[PDB]
Amino acid sequence: METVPWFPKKISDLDHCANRVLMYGSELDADHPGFKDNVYRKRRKYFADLAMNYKHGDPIPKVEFTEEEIKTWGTVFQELNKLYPTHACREYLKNLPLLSKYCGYREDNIPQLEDVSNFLKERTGFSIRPVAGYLSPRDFLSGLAFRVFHCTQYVRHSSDPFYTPEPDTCHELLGHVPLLAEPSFAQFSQEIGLASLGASEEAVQKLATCYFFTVEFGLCKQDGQLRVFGAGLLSSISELKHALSGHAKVKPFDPKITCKQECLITTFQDVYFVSESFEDAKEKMREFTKTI
């Protein structure tokens, strides 16, 4: 019995997928990253309940971060900012100062999702909702159709600030947000979501893999040199350096090819894809979505 899967028809309908969170020991066959740390586990439950209780139209709950959480943020923020000028794409560097000015991006302060959401709404019409963890590719991409980015609010475990196998709020705020503030990138991202809505399982998988190798882990060509625009790279001190080290394979971004590449979880990627620019990746995606 083949039916079209339910899809959101307006922004408030994301209330009916934001709590469909994939869990360790259930949908996800993997260990929780501070599982054996009872204190970390308790703190993670606090963050999950804030997300689960959220409903469209609520202000996003403001959190008093612990001293340890703030320190982890500061370590990540300080070391990544030493890398950005040489590693980050131009569009990323243009937007980062604005977030420092308006949203409290500082070494000693974790920006609040409510403030960042308000900033994005003014710049590109993007908004945030808090989320307890991963959603399905279909659900996550459905948010993008309404320019909603589902964001984790917890901080990665202090036992490895340089790379985490799971997204955290450092990753959302330093990896994703500065490019969500750029109109061409915001358009690019929305168009992935729009193409996903009610699509086939196969079309969703392919769109998700294209997202992974652009929004998550993309490299781009700028003035004859590779720079980084993938959010998963821009939030890892160790993978950001790796991507431009020459230790990894690179291929040209090409949706019909890129959509077949395995997305690696819990390690550095084996391969990065290089887009010429945001406009060109967007054009390539437009040509590809006609076919699926």
Ligand SMILES: COc1cccc(Oc2cccc(N3CCCCC3)c2CNC(=N)NC(=O)c2ccc(C[C@H](N)C(=O)O)cc2)c1
């Ligand atoms: C064991 O867990 C599993 C098992 C199976 C699949 C799985 O991946 C899923 C699951 C559901 C949806 C998705 N999407 C969502 C968006 C649309 C494309 C598909 C994905 C694909 N993953 C991601 N999009 N992202 C990451 O995995 C990621 C990014 C950054 C960091 C942080 C970074 N390393 C740092 O140190 O700062 C960590 C991880 C995870």
Ligand SMILES: [Fe+3]
């Ligand atoms: Fe991400």
